[PDB]
Enzyme design. Structure first.
Site, PDB file in Angstrom:
ATOM      1  N   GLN A  93       5.834   5.489  -4.134  1.00 23.27           N
ATOM      2  CA  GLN A  93       4.537   5.348  -4.779  1.00 23.27           C
ATOM      3  C   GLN A  93       4.618   5.601  -6.289  1.00 23.27           C
ATOM      4  O   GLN A  93       3.930   4.938  -7.061  1.00 23.27           O
ATOM      5  CB  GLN A  93       3.513   6.282  -4.127  1.00 23.27           C
ATOM      6  CG  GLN A  93       2.074   5.878  -4.421  1.00 23.27           C
ATOM      7  CD  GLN A  93       1.062   6.859  -3.895  1.00 23.27           C
ATOM      8  OE1 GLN A  93       1.344   8.045  -3.758  1.00 23.27           O
ATOM      9  NE2 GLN A  93      -0.131   6.376  -3.611  1.00 23.27           N
TER      10      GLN A  93
ATOM     11  N   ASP B   5       6.545   2.452  -7.753  1.00 29.98           N
ATOM     12  CA  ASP B   5       5.580   1.378  -7.757  1.00 29.98           C
ATOM     13  C   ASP B   5       4.589   1.462  -8.922  1.00 29.98           C
ATOM     14  O   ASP B   5       4.448   0.511  -9.690  1.00 29.98           O
ATOM     15  CB  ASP B   5       4.827   1.359  -6.433  1.00 29.98           C
ATOM     16  CG  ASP B   5       3.600   0.502  -6.496  1.00 29.98           C
ATOM     17  OD1 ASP B   5       2.494   1.019  -6.265  1.00 29.98           O
ATOM     18  OD2 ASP B   5       3.733  -0.693  -6.809  1.00 29.98           O
TER      19      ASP B   5
ATOM     20  N   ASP C 147       4.672   2.858 -11.657  1.00 33.62           N
ATOM     21  CA  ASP C 147       5.305   2.667 -12.949  1.00 33.62           C
ATOM     22  C   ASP C 147       5.363   1.162 -13.221  1.00 33.62           C
ATOM     23  O   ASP C 147       5.089   0.699 -14.332  1.00 33.62           O
ATOM     24  CB  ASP C 147       6.723   3.252 -12.902  1.00 33.62           C
ATOM     25  CG  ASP C 147       7.291   3.570 -14.272  1.00 33.62           C
ATOM     26  OD1 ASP C 147       7.266   2.704 -15.174  1.00 33.62           O
ATOM     27  OD2 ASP C 147       7.799   4.697 -14.429  1.00 33.62           O
TER      28      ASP C 147
ATOM     29  N   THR D  79       3.389  -1.540 -17.794  1.00 28.67           N
ATOM     30  CA  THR D  79       4.616  -2.150 -18.301  1.00 28.67           C
ATOM     31  C   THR D  79       5.599  -2.406 -17.169  1.00 28.67           C
ATOM     32  O   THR D  79       5.672  -1.621 -16.229  1.00 28.67           O
ATOM     33  CB  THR D  79       5.281  -1.265 -19.382  1.00 28.67           C
ATOM     34  OG1 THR D  79       5.728  -0.032 -18.799  1.00 28.67           O
ATOM     35  CG2 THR D  79       4.296  -0.966 -20.499  1.00 28.67           C
TER      36      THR D  79
ATOM     37  N   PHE E  93       8.807  -2.252 -17.107  1.00 23.74           N
ATOM     38  CA  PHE E  93      10.033  -1.472 -17.168  1.00 23.74           C
ATOM     39  C   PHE E  93       9.878  -0.128 -16.481  1.00 23.74           C
ATOM     40  O   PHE E  93       8.807   0.478 -16.535  1.00 23.74           O
ATOM     41  CB  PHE E  93      10.436  -1.277 -18.628  1.00 23.74           C
ATOM     42  CG  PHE E  93      10.431  -2.555 -19.425  1.00 23.74           C
ATOM     43  CD1 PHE E  93      11.402  -3.522 -19.216  1.00 23.74           C
ATOM     44  CD2 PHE E  93       9.439  -2.799 -20.363  1.00 23.74           C
ATOM     45  CE1 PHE E  93      11.387  -4.692 -19.928  1.00 23.74           C
ATOM     46  CE2 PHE E  93       9.425  -3.981 -21.080  1.00 23.74           C
ATOM     47  CZ  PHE E  93      10.402  -4.926 -20.859  1.00 23.74           C
TER      48      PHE E  93
ATOM     49  N   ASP F 135       9.870   2.962 -16.927  1.00 20.00           N
ATOM     50  CA  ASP F 135       9.813   3.730 -18.168  1.00 20.00           C
ATOM     51  C   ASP F 135       8.821   4.892 -18.166  1.00 20.00           C
ATOM     52  O   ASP F 135       8.371   5.320 -19.231  1.00 20.00           O
ATOM     53  CB  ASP F 135       9.493   2.792 -19.341  1.00 20.00           C
ATOM     54  CG  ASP F 135       8.126   2.109 -19.210  1.00 20.00           C
ATOM     55  OD1 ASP F 135       7.415   2.341 -18.209  1.00 20.00           O
ATOM     56  OD2 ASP F 135       7.758   1.329 -20.113  1.00 20.00           O
TER      57      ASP F 135
ATOM     58  N   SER G  74       5.739   4.957 -17.379  1.00 17.74           N
ATOM     59  CA  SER G  74       4.471   4.551 -17.964  1.00 17.74           C
ATOM     60  C   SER G  74       3.315   5.216 -17.243  1.00 17.74           C
ATOM     61  O   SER G  74       2.202   5.288 -17.777  1.00 17.74           O
ATOM     62  CB  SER G  74       4.316   3.029 -17.936  1.00 17.74           C
ATOM     63  OG  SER G  74       4.540   2.525 -16.632  1.00 17.74           O
TER      64      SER G  74
ATOM     65  N   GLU H  95      -5.527   9.608  -6.676  1.00 19.48           N
ATOM     66  CA  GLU H  95      -5.764   8.882  -5.427  1.00 19.48           C
ATOM     67  C   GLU H  95      -5.418   9.672  -4.147  1.00 19.48           C
ATOM     68  O   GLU H  95      -5.962   9.403  -3.070  1.00 19.48           O
ATOM     69  CB  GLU H  95      -5.021   7.549  -5.456  1.00 19.48           C
ATOM     70  CG  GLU H  95      -5.331   6.624  -4.304  1.00 19.48           C
ATOM     71  CD  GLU H  95      -4.514   6.935  -3.072  1.00 19.48           C
ATOM     72  OE1 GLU H  95      -3.396   7.466  -3.182  1.00 19.48           O
ATOM     73  OE2 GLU H  95      -5.001   6.642  -1.974  1.00 19.48           O
TER      74      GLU H  95
ATOM     75  N   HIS I 145       3.418   1.751   2.511  1.00 20.35           N
ATOM     76  CA  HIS I 145       2.168   2.094   3.195  1.00 20.35           C
ATOM     77  C   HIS I 145       2.387   2.486   4.648  1.00 20.35           C
ATOM     78  O   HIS I 145       1.691   3.344   5.173  1.00 20.35           O
ATOM     79  CB  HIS I 145       1.158   0.950   3.094  1.00 20.35           C
ATOM     80  CG  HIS I 145       0.578   0.781   1.725  1.00 20.35           C
ATOM     81  ND1 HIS I 145      -0.145  -0.331   1.351  1.00 20.35           N
ATOM     82  CD2 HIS I 145       0.611   1.589   0.639  1.00 20.35           C
ATOM     83  CE1 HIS I 145      -0.540  -0.198   0.097  1.00 20.35           C
ATOM     84  NE2 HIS I 145      -0.091   0.956  -0.358  1.00 20.35           N
TER      85      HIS I 145
HETATM   86  C1  HEM Z   1      -3.541   6.555  -0.141  1.00 18.91           C
HETATM   87  C2  HEM Z   1      -2.326   5.693  -0.548  1.00 18.91           C
HETATM   88  C3  HEM Z   1      -1.043   6.041  -0.381  1.00 18.91           C
HETATM   89  C4  HEM Z   1      -0.474   7.358   0.220  1.00 18.91           C
HETATM   90  C5  HEM Z   1      -1.136   8.088   1.132  1.00 18.91           C
HETATM   91  C6  HEM Z   1      -0.232   4.952  -0.875  1.00 18.91           C
HETATM   92  C7  HEM Z   1       1.140   4.937  -0.874  1.00 18.91           C
HETATM   93  C8  HEM Z   1       1.963   3.939  -1.330  1.00 18.91           C
HETATM   94  C9  HEM Z   1       3.412   3.935  -1.249  1.00 18.91           C
HETATM   95  C10 HEM Z   1       4.255   5.085  -0.625  1.00 18.91           C
HETATM   96  C11 HEM Z   1       3.843   2.779  -1.807  1.00 18.91           C
HETATM   97  C12 HEM Z   1       5.302   2.262  -1.987  1.00 18.91           C
HETATM   98  C13 HEM Z   1       6.391   2.938  -1.589  1.00 18.91           C
HETATM   99  C14 HEM Z   1       2.667   2.043  -2.245  1.00 18.91           C
HETATM  100  C15 HEM Z   1       2.666   0.814  -2.865  1.00 18.91           C
HETATM  101  C16 HEM Z   1       1.581   0.125  -3.370  1.00 18.91           C
HETATM  102  N1  HEM Z   1       0.248   0.426  -3.150  1.00 18.91           N
HETATM  103 FE1  HEM Z   1      -0.398   2.149  -2.196  1.00 18.91          FE
HETATM  104  N2  HEM Z   1      -1.058   3.951  -1.336  1.00 18.91           N
HETATM  105  C17 HEM Z   1      -2.364   4.359  -1.153  1.00 18.91           C
HETATM  106  C18 HEM Z   1      -3.485   3.613  -1.492  1.00 18.91           C
HETATM  107  C19 HEM Z   1      -3.495   2.391  -2.159  1.00 18.91           C
HETATM  108  C20 HEM Z   1      -4.663   1.602  -2.554  1.00 18.91           C
HETATM  109  C21 HEM Z   1      -6.139   1.979  -2.290  1.00 18.91           C
HETATM  110  C22 HEM Z   1      -4.228   0.491  -3.179  1.00 18.91           C
HETATM  111  C23 HEM Z   1      -5.091  -0.645  -3.790  1.00 18.91           C
HETATM  112  C24 HEM Z   1      -5.001  -1.916  -2.944  1.00 18.91           C
HETATM  113  C25 HEM Z   1      -5.839  -3.027  -3.538  1.00 18.91           C
HETATM  114  O1  HEM Z   1      -5.377  -4.198  -3.486  1.00 18.91           O
HETATM  115  O2  HEM Z   1      -6.967  -2.765  -4.061  1.00 18.91           O
HETATM  116  C26 HEM Z   1      -2.781   0.536  -3.206  1.00 18.91           C
HETATM  117  C27 HEM Z   1      -1.966  -0.418  -3.773  1.00 18.91           C
HETATM  118  C28 HEM Z   1      -0.587  -0.457  -3.805  1.00 18.91           C
HETATM  119  C29 HEM Z   1       0.220  -1.434  -4.519  1.00 18.91           C
HETATM  120  C30 HEM Z   1      -0.238  -2.618  -5.418  1.00 18.91           C
HETATM  121  C31 HEM Z   1      -0.331  -2.081  -6.863  1.00 18.91           C
HETATM  122  C32 HEM Z   1      -0.907  -3.098  -7.826  1.00 18.91           C
HETATM  123  O3  HEM Z   1      -0.145  -3.988  -8.300  1.00 18.91           O
HETATM  124  O4  HEM Z   1      -2.128  -3.022  -8.135  1.00 18.91           O
HETATM  125  C33 HEM Z   1       1.664  -1.038  -4.223  1.00 18.91           C
HETATM  126  C34 HEM Z   1       2.930  -1.759  -4.729  1.00 18.91           C
HETATM  127  N3  HEM Z   1      -2.371   1.696  -2.578  1.00 18.91           N
HETATM  128  N4  HEM Z   1       1.547   2.776  -1.938  1.00 18.91           N
HETATM  129 CA   LIG Z   2       6.491   0.756 -16.383  1.00 17.87          CA
END
Ligand code: HEM
Ligand SMILES: [Ca+2]
Ligand SMILES: *[C@@H]1O[C@H](CO)[C@@H](O[C@@H]2O[C@H](CO)[C@@H](O[C@H]3O[C@H](CO)[C@@H](O)[C@H](O)[C@@H]3O)[C@H](O)[C@H]2NC(C)=O)[C@H](O)[C@H]1NC(C)=O
Ligand SMILES: *[C@@H]1O[C@H](CO)[C@@H](O[C@@H]2O[C@H](CO)[C@@H](O[C@H]3O[C@H](CO)[C@@H](O)[C@H](O)[C@@H]3O)[C@H](O)[C@H]2NC(C)=O)[C@H](O)[C@H]1NC(C)=O
Ligand SMILES: *[C@@H]1O[C@H](CO)[C@@H](O[C@@H]2O[C@H](CO)[C@@H](O)[C@H](O)[C@H]2NC(C)=O)[C@H](O)[C@H]1NC(C)=O
Ligand SMILES: *[C@@H]1O[C@H](CO)[C@@H](O[C@@H]2O[C@H](CO)[C@@H](O)[C@H](O)[C@H]2NC(C)=O)[C@H](O)[C@H]1NC(C)=O
Length: 595
Positions: free
Chosen positions: A105, A108, A110, A184, A186, A188, A190, A258, A351
């Protein structure tokens, strides 16, 4: 394939050209093409967008228009039939700690962030979407199917608003619709420092030239820092307990609060910045505020990149690690560093690793009090549990001694996430992460499952028998078929996660490809990659190779027993060692002489 210069809404700045430091927006990493990998630009398209009207409208929007001849199943129904389960017992990962999930998380957040469209405050369409569920413009509701228990309890739908897009933001009319990456590309940190000049500045302590990050003034954690509270009200974190009245934290990234464990991890990183900043100050008294800020920032960035590529990805991609991320041969300016739109859903694999409960532990790793184990759903946007109930140490021990949730074809996403997700905009603990994810794929115009299997040079099943073979599961494959009619229609999120895991990894053949490529690109395309000669010195590199998340704990908390390998499952007290036994980061190669 397209046009070329629709590069509007962007804070345009001039490149320092010779600066040893990254820009906050991400601009200027690439010299031939400055904005490549920057923030507030469209996510890269590895494949052409698939929209209903081949432009902007998602599939499932118009109820009469089909995809490949079939009607796309409702997000929430795909959720209720495939993604659900009731029995949490047996669902844990025998060889991955809770942290394994928590880091994904971080990584991601970042890399990518696609914010919903705004144009809304003191507005009735936020209510026209919430109350009446009228699909229109950016309101794209997730309807409940027939026989869904949330019908009796919540309403006819869950509000869902389409993600933001390139040059304008309101209506529009031109070419295809590309979503925004608000962070960003990278690796990094962020999420620690921010991706906008303004936020990045608010986050800084400019009252003192010590290059420290702003900390909380209202609350402390055993002489240790918390993140600064957030200015803005209404605050989601004040809502969940109107008596406690404790705001959300203000970090580099907006999703910071969150969930408790996420905020915990952030807190650990803020603390590590200030640690480095004063340890660097002791080594280099002559350096100014800006210098300490940038040098520490650079180290935190290095730190994140190392853990991710050395400890985290080899236990995700397993044996496929070599196939997609071969050893670093140096910076390559021809590589596209940008995060692809499909990656932002591929990484949502994490998730299925989130468990149902979160634990606190005293000093003997024993349960911390009467209510030591709490349900996940009571922790979304919950800060009062940290501040008003024990600090971050009991939560950090949990992260170490407890396990992640093993992805399981029969038991995919916990009900704490599938049924009781809290959304900062709304008032109930009743959203479905699974539906949202599936609805968002369609929102973003993702090509089908077979489109990505083909993209990765993998067989493309057309039949039930084909799908059973690839998924190695008759039942699962059958349910997917009855919902989607055609493997070409399976949404990439549910499709990719449904495949069995690769040897010694935690994702399938298709996910290991999408992730693999992306991570290979952001590394090979990042000029400020830690191994890229000239970024750090050979001695500096020699010192960074010794970093370990375990140490980070030791230096930033009051924990004294930690494991050497914090990502595998570790048992107290057998696998735990005293912090004194753990290698330190020798910051001495960061010394600078006058004469
Ligand atoms: C609560 C939430 C989490 C933990 C209890 C949780 C966890 C993760 C992990 C462990 C991820 C990768 C290893 C991961 C990836 C991405 N998530 Fe997620 N996440 C929780 C809650 C949310 C919610 C709410 C969203 C928004 C979804 C939407 O479309 O509105 C969410 C998103 C994402 C996401 C997309 C990021 C983006 O580009 O906006 C991951 C790559 N997570 N989560
Ligand atoms: Ca970044
Ligand atoms: C539980 O997960 C453990 C962590 O992955 C795992 O231990 C690891 O085993 C792998 C081989 O399967 C080894 O991988 C490393 O091997 C050498 C060490 O000499 C390194 O130079 C390589 O880079 C490579 O990554 C490790 O020996 C080991 N890793 C760690 C961190 O301990 C256990 O085997 C797993 N337990 C079971 C039975 O599944
Ligand atoms: C909203 O947050 C409140 C605090 O942020 C929380 O109340 C707190 O929780 C418990 C009682 O539920 C108390 O903890 C203990 O207090 C003393 C020992 O210090 C004992 O006598 C009690 O038995 C109990 O174990 C806190 O003191 C209490 N704080 C206050 C002032 O309220 C609420 O539980 C939260 N409410 C919701 C809706 O979640
Ligand atoms: C900005 O940094 C300054 C200086 O480091 C901080 O001031 C210190 O605050 C701590 C905790 O309140 C105390 O030890 C002293 O009152 C201050 N020390 C000095 C040397 O002035 C200040 O807390 C930081 N401000 C923000 C917004 O985080
Ligand atoms: C830097 O990366 C680029 C892009 O991935 C590599 O460019 C490839 O060059 C080969 C020739 O050896 C061509 O067959 C490919 O078409 C190119 N890749 C693509 C798909 O653009 C390049 O090899 C890398 N630089 C070096 C020399 O290591």
């Amino acid at each position: 394939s397209w046009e070329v210069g629709c590069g509007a809404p962007v804070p345009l700045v001039k490149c320092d050209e010779n600066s040893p430091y990254r820009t906050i927006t991400g601009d200027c990493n690439n010299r031939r093409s400055p904005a490549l990998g920057a923030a507030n630009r469209a996510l890269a398209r590895w494949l052409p967008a698939e929209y209903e009207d081949g432009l902007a409208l998602p599939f499932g929007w118009t109820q009469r228009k089909t995809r490949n001849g079939f009607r796309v199943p409702l997000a929430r129904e795909v959720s209720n039939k495939i993604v659900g389960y009731l029995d949490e017992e047996g669902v844990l990962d025998q060889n991955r700690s809770l942290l394994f999930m928590q880091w994904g998380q971080i990584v991601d957040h970042d890399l990518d962030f696609a914010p919903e469209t705004e144009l809304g405050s003191n507005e009735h369409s936020k209510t026209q979407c919430e109350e009446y569920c009228i699909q229109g413009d950016n309101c794209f509701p997730i309807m409940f199917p027939k026989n869904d228990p949330k019908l009796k309890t919540q309403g006819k739908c869950m509000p869902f608003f389409r993600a933001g897009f390139v040059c304008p933001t309101p209506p529009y009319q031109s070419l295809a619709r590309e979503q925004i990456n608000a962070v960003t590309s990278f690796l990094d940190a962020s999420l620690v420092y921010g991706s906008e000049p303004s936020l990045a500045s608010r986050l800084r302590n400019l009252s003192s030239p010590l290059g420290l990050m702003a900390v909380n003034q209202e609350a402390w954690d055993h002489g240790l820092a918390y993140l600064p509270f957030n200015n803005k009200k209404p605050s989601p974190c004040e809502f969940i307990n109107t008596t406690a009245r404790v705001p959300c934290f203000l970090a580099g990234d907006f999703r910071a609060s969150e969930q408790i464990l996420l905020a915990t991890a952030h807190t650990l990183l803020l603390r590590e910045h200030n640690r480095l900043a004063r340890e660097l100050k002791k080594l280099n008294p002559h350096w100014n505020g800006e210098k300490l800020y940038q040098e520490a920032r650079k180290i935190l960035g290095a730190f994140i990149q190392i853990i991710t590529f050395r400890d985290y990805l080899p236990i995700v991609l397993g044996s496929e690690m070599q196939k997609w991320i071969p050893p670093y041969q140096g910076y390559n300016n021809s590589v596209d560093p940008r995060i692809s739109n499909v990656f932002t859903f591929a990484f949502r694999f994490g998730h299925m690793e989130v468990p149902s409960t979160v634990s606190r532990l005293d000093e003997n790793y024993q349960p911390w009090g009467p209510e030591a184990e709490l349900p996940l759903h009571t922790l979304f946007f919950n800060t009062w549990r940290i501040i008003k109930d024990g600090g971050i140490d009991p939560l950090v021990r949990g992260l170490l001694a407890k396990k992640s949730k093993l992805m399981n074809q029969d038991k995919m996403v916990t009900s704490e996430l599938r049924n009781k997700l809290f959304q900062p905009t709304h008032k109930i603990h009743g959203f479905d992460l699974a539906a949202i994810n599936l609805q968002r794929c369609r929102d973003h115009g993702m090509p089908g499952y077979n489109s990505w299997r083909g993209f990765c040079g993998l067989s493309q099943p057309k039949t039930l028998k084909g799908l059973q073979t690839v998924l190695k599961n008759k039942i699962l494959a059958k349910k997917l078929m009855d919902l989607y009619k055609t493997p070409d229609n399976i949404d990439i999120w549910i499709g990719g996660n449904a495949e069995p895991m690769v040897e010694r990894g935690r994702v399938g053949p298709l996910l290991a490809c999408l992730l693999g490529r992306q991570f290979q690109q952001i590394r090979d395309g990042d000029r400020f990659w830690w191994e890229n000669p000239g970024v750090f010195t050979e001695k500096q590199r020699d010192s960074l190779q010794k970093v370990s998340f375990s140490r980070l704990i030791c230096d930033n908390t009051h924990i004294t027993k930690v494991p050497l390998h914090a990502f595998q499952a570790n048992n107290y007290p057998h696998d735990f060692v005293d912090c004194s036994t753990v290698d330190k980061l020798d910051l001495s190669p960061w010394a600078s002489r006058e004469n």
